[PDB]
Write a protein that binds this DNA or RNA. Sequence first.
RNA 1: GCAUGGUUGUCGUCAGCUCGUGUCGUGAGAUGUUGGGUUAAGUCCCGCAACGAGCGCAACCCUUGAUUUUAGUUGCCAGCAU
Length: 120
Amino acid sequence: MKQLLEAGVHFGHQTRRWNPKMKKYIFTERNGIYIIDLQKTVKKVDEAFNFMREVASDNGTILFVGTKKQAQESVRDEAIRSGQYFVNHRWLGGTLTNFETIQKRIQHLKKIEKMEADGT
RNA sequence: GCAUGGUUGUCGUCAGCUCGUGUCGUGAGAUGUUGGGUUAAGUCCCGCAACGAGCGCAACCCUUGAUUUUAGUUGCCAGCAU
Ligand SMILES: [Mg+2]
Ligand SMILES: [Mg+2]
Ligand SMILES: [Mg+2]
Ligand SMILES: [Mg+2]
Ligand SMILES: [Mg+2]
Ligand SMILES: [Mg+2]
Ligand SMILES: [Mg+2]
Ligand SMILES: [Mg+2]
Ligand SMILES: [Mg+2]
Ligand SMILES: [Mg+2]
Ligand SMILES: [Mg+2]
Ligand SMILES: [Mg+2]
């Protein structure tokens, strides 16, 4: 349910393209591809589970960020179901530091949308 | 006219000149404005740590090509007499 459940395609990247900081997270070395300690994955996903417990115990706003082309259906669908927020296309430079300009553009689209339907 | 105001030529109606808020730089600064396409054009698109805006481009002005209403003299003459 936590170790054997995933199985399938849960391997790493090629040996040439790797980060040394991950030496503790590698199980074995396959042909180029590395192998990741699934035993570890369980503990740390449990800590992520508990951290999101603490975060979302109160009414909190969260963002699902994902652009990798094998990601842009999920983040959208569980963000819609969970009612939280997501960015699935490219990340515009400064959506948080320039939150003011981004929300001006949001207000622009929203106002012209009420123009289209609620207005003339 | 080499002390000036005003008026004009020229590149050339060529496509440029900048700002606000963010980020990257010890700093002067940088990015946007670089790259690939497309356009008459910084015209637009796709990329991309930038998101937008302003003066220049374009539009508003004049004329020409089609047509409707209003108006028939000094304009026009079709069906009618001269
Ligand atoms: Mg003289
Ligand atoms: Mg003089
Ligand atoms: Mg002179
Ligand atoms: Mg002289
Ligand atoms: Mg002079
Ligand atoms: Mg002289
Ligand atoms: Mg020049
Ligand atoms: Mg120049
Ligand atoms: Mg320039
Ligand atoms: Mg440059
Ligand atoms: Mg322009
Ligand atoms: Mg013009």
